[PDB]
Amino acid sequence: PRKGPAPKRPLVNDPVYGSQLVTQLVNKVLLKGKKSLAERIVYGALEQARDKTGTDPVITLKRALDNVKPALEVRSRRVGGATYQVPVEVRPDRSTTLALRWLVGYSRQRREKTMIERLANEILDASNGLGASVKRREDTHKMAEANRAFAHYRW
Amino acid sequence: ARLVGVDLPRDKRMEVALTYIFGIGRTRSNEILAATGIDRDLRTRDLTEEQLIHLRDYIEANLKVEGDLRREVQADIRRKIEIGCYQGLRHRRGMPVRGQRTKTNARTRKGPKRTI
Amino acid sequence: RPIQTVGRRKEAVVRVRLVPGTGKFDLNGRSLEDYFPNKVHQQLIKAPLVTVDRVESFDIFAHLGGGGPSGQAGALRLGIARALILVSPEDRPALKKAGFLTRDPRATERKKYGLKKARKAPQYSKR
Amino acid sequence: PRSLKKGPFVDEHLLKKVDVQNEKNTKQVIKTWSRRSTIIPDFIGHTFAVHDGRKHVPVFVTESMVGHKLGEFAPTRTFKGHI
Amino acid sequence: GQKINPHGFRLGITTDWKSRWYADKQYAEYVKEDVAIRRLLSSGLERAGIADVEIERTRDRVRVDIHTARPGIVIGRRGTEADRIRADLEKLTGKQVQLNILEVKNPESQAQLVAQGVAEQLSNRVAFRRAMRKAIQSAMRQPNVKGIRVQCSGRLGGAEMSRSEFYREGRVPLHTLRADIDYGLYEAKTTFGRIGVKVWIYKGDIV
Amino acid sequence: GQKIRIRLKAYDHEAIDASARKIVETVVRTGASVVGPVPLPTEKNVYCVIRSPHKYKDSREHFEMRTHKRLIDIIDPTPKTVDALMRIDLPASVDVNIQ
Amino acid sequence: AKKALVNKAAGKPRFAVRAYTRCSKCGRPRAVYRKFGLCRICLREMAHAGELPGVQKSSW
RNA sequence: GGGGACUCGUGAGAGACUGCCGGGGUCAACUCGGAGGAAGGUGGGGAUGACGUCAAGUCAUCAUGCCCCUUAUGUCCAGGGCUUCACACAUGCUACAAUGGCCGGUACAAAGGGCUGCGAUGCCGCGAGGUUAAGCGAAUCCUUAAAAGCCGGUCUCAGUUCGGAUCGGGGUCUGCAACUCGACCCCGUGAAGUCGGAGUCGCUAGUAAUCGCAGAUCAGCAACGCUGCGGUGAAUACGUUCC
Ligand SMILES: [Mg+2]
Ligand SMILES: [Mg+2]
Ligand SMILES: [Mg+2]
Ligand SMILES: [Mg+2]
Ligand SMILES: [Mg+2]
Ligand SMILES: [Mg+2]
Ligand SMILES: [Mg+2]
Ligand SMILES: [Mg+2]
Ligand SMILES: [Mg+2]
Ligand SMILES: [Mg+2]
Ligand SMILES: [Mg+2]
Ligand SMILES: [Mg+2]
Ligand SMILES: [Mg+2]
Ligand SMILES: [Mg+2]
Ligand SMILES: [Mg+2]
Ligand SMILES: [Mg+2]
Ligand SMILES: [Mg+2]
Ligand SMILES: [Mg+2]
Ligand SMILES: [Zn+2]
C-alpha cells in the first residue's frame, strides 16, 4: 500500500472451459475453503445455461459480464461540513471484479431452491439485460452522472 | 390419517410422521416401522386401513404415549415439590434443577430479560 | 536402470517412476481417476507433459505418501518435471519459464502464543 | 451407588445407629453429619438432623424420600430475595 | 525485568550445563534432591565464596564439584570441613558422594564472586559508588576481560526512594550470541532490606 | 551373527557419537565385528510456561528437551568382549541399555 | 506456602486419592509439573541457569 | 530370505553474497530490471525488548525492612462455601439452514503421549462401557478410524428431517464419597432463534475463512479455554485527502 504497488497473483485456466473468466468465477462463489463445491456449482450453472439457450456457455458469460461491467463509479470524500461523492474513471481490471461479484452477490438472494440454477437464472437474465445485476450498473452510473459537478477532486 | 387421536399429517414419510406422537422420536419410530413391516419410505396419503391397525397395537402394548405420558411427567414433578427436596424447592421458583450456572445465563427456566 | 525422482509440495512426498509407454498413470496401483477424481487436480498432474510434447508417452506410476489430496497432486507435478530432465537434458528452458521446476516453498506458518491462529488476534475492546 | 455394580453406599456410622433402634421399636432423633448417605427403607420410621453449616436441620423420612440422599433436604444456601 | 538470563540465552550454544546425568523414571526424584543439595551449599559456606556448584551422577555414584575463591576455607583444619559436609551430603542422598573441591583462577574476573564482594561491602555500609567502582577497575586489569557492567538496585545508602543505577566500562554486548557473558546475581543483607547486585563480564568471542 | 544389541540415549548431539565412534566402536580390533552408528529419531518434549508470576497470560516462553536416542550398535559376541564392554567407560551424559 | 500444608502434603493422608502434588522447591499447589517435580516459576529460573539437564530454550 | 537404488530418519559440509551483465546515480551509498539458479535482494517464520516511562502488577511462588497475633490472626478435623442471582459488561462455542440436515459407500494427514500405564484381538452390551489377555519403556507395539472432501439416495423452503436449550426416565466410569457440585451414554420432550440497533474487531498468503487430531495440568472432569499441529484454501491493495 503506502510504499508501492503490491504484486499480483496469476491464474490457471479451467480444464472444462478454457477461459480465465471461469476460474475467476468459481473463485468468488467459494466460501469456507470448499473449492470443489464451488466448481460443482459454476459447472452446473454453465451446463444448465445451455439446456435452455443451446449456445455456448462461455459466450453467454462473456456478454452477461459485459452488461454488468461499469466504467464510472463514485467514491466518497469530505471537504467541509458536507461530504460529497466524486465520480472517478474505473481501470479495466477493477471492472471485471465488480461485475463478477454483482453476479454472485445477487444470486444468493433469489427465490429458487438451489444455487445450481440461481446462478443460472442470473447469467441468463444479464445476458439479455434483465436481472438485478444489470440494475446496479445503471444505478452505479446514475448516481455518478447526477454528481458530475464534483469531477475535479481526483485526489 | 389418525393413529391414536394425534392427527398424522399428509404428504410426509412415516419415518418422520410417527414422531409427532408425544412419545416417539427418531429411534422408537424406527422400531415401530420394523416390527409391523411398514417400510421407511411410505407416505401418509396412501396408508392402508388395516396397516394402521397393526401400527396401533404394537404401541399400545409396549410403549407409553400421551394422555398419561403427560401425566407421567407432571406427576413426577408433583412428587418432588411436596417431599421437600431441594430439587423440588427448585421447581417452585423457575430455576435450573441440575446445578447450572445461574449468574449470567439461565434464561430458559426464567424468561427473557427485564432490567430492573 | 530406469529413472526415478522425488517431489514434495506441502508435506506430501512422492516418488515417481518413469517407464516409457502409452500414458497410464497407475498411482499406488490404481488409476488416475480412481483417487484423483477432480478435473482441476488432473490438469496440474499432466501439466508439464504439454511442454515436453509427450502427453501420450511415458506411462508412469508412483508412490504417494503424506500430505493431502492437493499436496499429493502438486508433489506429483514436480516429480514428473524433474523426471523429464534426466531422460532428456535438452528441454531445460522449456520447463524453466513454466515454473514447474520450482518447489514453491510454502508451508504452514506456525501458531503463535497469544494469537489464536498464525496471524489472527483476539478482540481488542478498548474499554 | 451411582453405578449399580458396587451397590448403594451408605456411611457405616449411621447404619449402626439405625439398626440398634429398629430392632426394639425405638424412634429417637439422630444427630448426624452424613449428607452423602442414601435412604434405605430400613429407617422409614424415624427422623434425622442433617448438617448444613449453621445447624442441624431436622428431616422426617416419611415414605417416598427413598432413593434420594439425606443432603437433598438441607438447602445450605438461604436467599430469601433481592428485595 | 526485560533482559533474560544471559546464561539461558546461550545455553548449549556457548555455555554448558551445570548438572550431568540421564533419567526417565527417576528424573523427578533426582531434581528433588539436586536442589536439596544446593540448599546445603549456600548456608554454611557463604564465607568461602562459592562460584558455582556442579552436580553429576553416574549410576549411584554422585560427584559434587564446587568452585570457590578460598579453597582452604572449604577444606577447614586440614580435613575437618571438606569431610564435615561429606558426612552431610551422604546422609541426605544415601550414596558415596565424592566432593571434589576445586579452585578459581581469577576471582576478580568471574561473576557471582565479583557480584558477591560488592554485596559484602554494601552489607557493611561502604558508599555504593565506591563499592561498584572498585569491581569495575579490579576486573579490567586482567588480560581476558574486555568489559564489565555492574547494576545495583534497592534502598541504596539507607534512603527511602528505591533507585537503580549502573556503571559500565569497555563493551558488554548482551545480544551477541557468539560472545561469552558471565553473569552473577547476589542479594546483599542490609539493615533496611535488600540490595541486589548484577554483574555482567564479557570475555570475548568463541567459535 | 551379531546378537548383542545395545542402545544409546543422551541429552545432546556430539556427546553420544564422539563417545561411541571412538569408544563404543572399539570392538572391531578386539576380535569382533560391528555395523556402525545407526541414527534414530530425536524425541522432543515441549513445555510452555507463563513468564510472569502474576496476571500476564499473554507472555510465555518455550522449553524443549531433545532426547537423542541414537546409534544402534550391533556387535559380534566374542567371549572376551561380552563383559569387556562393561569395562568400557562411558561418561555421565550417555546411558547404555546392553540388555 | 503455609508450612503446615507443605508438611501435610508429603505424609500419608486418609483416602489415598486425597493426596495432591506441590512443588519441591517452593510450595505452590498450582501449576506443578510431574516430569520435573517443579512449578512453572522454579522451572523457569532453573532452566536458564543450566541447573536441570536437557532443557534449553526452544525455537521451531 | 533379502537388497544400497528411491524416500525417510540425522551426522558433517556446499548454497545467496547486489557476487556476474545491461540502465540511473558525486568515478558514492543505493535503486529499477535480466542471466544463472530449489531459493534474490532481510528468501519466509521463531529466539533476542536499548536509556528509560507508568509511585504499572504481585508482600499470595519465593526472598525481605518495619509494624502486628502468640489459650490465637497459630494448628488438626469433619460438614459448608468459592458454583448462590431482580440484573449490567466482557471473551468464546453452537446456531438460525439447501454452498445445508439425515442416511449407506469410500479415499488422503501431521505433530504427539504411554509401566500408578496404553487394551490389539476375541466374546457380550442399542450405547457409554464390561471382560479376557497378545504385543510393547516403544521409528517395533498400542494410542489410530483423521474430519471436512468424493459417489450415490432422501427431505423441497416449513420454527421444519433446521435448532438442541430445558426437563422427566433408566444406566455406565473414576473415587472413601458425585446431594448441594463431575463427564459420558441411551429413551421421550422439543425452548429462544429466520443473519442481529448506535457503535465496534481481526486479517496482505499457505493469510483470513472453515475442518478435525494431539499435548500440558489430571483419579475423573465444567477442555467450547490455552499451547501446538496439519487438511481444504480465497477475494483486494487505486492511493495518503480523511480517522
Ligand atoms: Mg487469552
Ligand atoms: Mg491452520
Ligand atoms: Mg484485555
Ligand atoms: Mg487432585
Ligand atoms: Mg538482532
Ligand atoms: Mg501503585
Ligand atoms: Mg493493587
Ligand atoms: Mg509475611
Ligand atoms: Mg475441610
Ligand atoms: Mg471461580
Ligand atoms: Mg430459511
Ligand atoms: Mg438435528
Ligand atoms: Mg457419512
Ligand atoms: Mg456388536
Ligand atoms: Mg451429496
Ligand atoms: Mg420466533
Ligand atoms: Mg504486515
Ligand atoms: Mg485430562
Ligand atoms: Zn516452585
Curated annotation (Swiss-Prot), chain A:
This is Small ribosomal subunit protein uS7. Keywords: Ribonucleoprotein, Ribosomal protein, RNA-binding, rRNA-binding, tRNA-binding. The lineage of its organism: Bacteria, Bacillati, Actinomycetota, Actinomycetes, Mycobacteriales. It comes from Mycobacterium tuberculosis (strain ATCC 25618 / H37Rv). The keyword Transport does not apply. Belongs to the universal ribosomal protein uS7 family. It holds the Pfam family Ribosomal_S7. Coiled coil: none annotated. NCBIfam families: rpsG_bact.
UniProtKB/Swiss-Prot annotation, chain B:
Residues 93-116 are annotated as: Disordered. GO terms for molecular function: rRNA binding; structural constituent of ribosome; tRNA binding. The keyword Kinase does not apply. It comes from the Bacteria. The keyword Disulfide bond does not apply. GO terms for biological process: translation. Keywords: Ribonucleoprotein, Ribosomal protein, RNA-binding, rRNA-binding, tRNA-binding. One of its GO terms (cellular component) is plasma membrane. InterPro entries: Rbsml_uS13_C, Ribosomal_uS13, Ribosomal_uS13-like_H2TH, Ribosomal_uS13_bac-type, Ribosomal_uS13_CS. Part of the 30S ribosomal subunit. Forms a loose heterodimer with protein S19. Forms two bridges to the 50S subunit in the 70S ribosome. Belongs to the universal ribosomal protein uS13 family. Located at the top of the head of the 30S subunit, it contacts several helices of the 16S rRNA. In the 70S ribosome it contacts the 23S rRNA (bridge B1a) and protein L5 of the 50S subunit (bridge B1b), connecting the 2 subunits; these bridges are implicated in subunit movement. Contacts the tRNAs in the A and P-sites. This is Small ribosomal subunit protein uS13. The gene is rpsM.
From Swiss-Prot, chain D:
GO terms for cellular component: cytoplasm; plasma membrane; small ribosomal subunit. NCBIfam families: rpsS_bact. Belongs to the universal ribosomal protein uS19 family. One of its GO terms (molecular function) is structural constituent of ribosome. Protein S19 forms a complex with S13 that binds strongly to the 16S ribosomal RNA. Keywords: Ribonucleoprotein, Ribosomal protein, RNA-binding, rRNA-binding. Disulfide bonds: none annotated. InterPro entries: Ribosomal_uS19, Ribosomal_uS19_bac-type, Ribosomal_uS19_CS, Ribosomal_uS19_SF. PANTHER family: RIBOSOMAL PROTEIN S19P FAMILY MEMBER, SMALL RIBOSOMAL SUBUNIT PROTEIN US19M. Pfam families: Ribosomal_S19. This is Small ribosomal subunit protein uS19. The gene is rpsS. GO terms for biological process: ribosomal small subunit assembly; translation. The keyword Ribosomal protein applies.
Curated annotation (Swiss-Prot), chain E:
GO terms for cellular component: cytosolic small ribosomal subunit; peptidoglycan-based cell wall; plasma membrane. Keywords: Ribonucleoprotein, Ribosomal protein, RNA-binding, rRNA-binding. The keyword Ribosomal protein applies. One of its GO terms (molecular function) is structural constituent of ribosome. It comes from the Bacteria. GO terms for biological process: translation. Residues 37-105 form the KH type-2 domain. Binds the lower part of the 30S subunit head. Binds mRNA in the 70S ribosome, positioning it for translation. Part of the 30S ribosomal subunit. Forms a tight complex with proteins S10 and S14. Belongs to the universal ribosomal protein uS3 family. This is Small ribosomal subunit protein uS3. The chain holds residues 2 to 208 of 274 of the full protein.
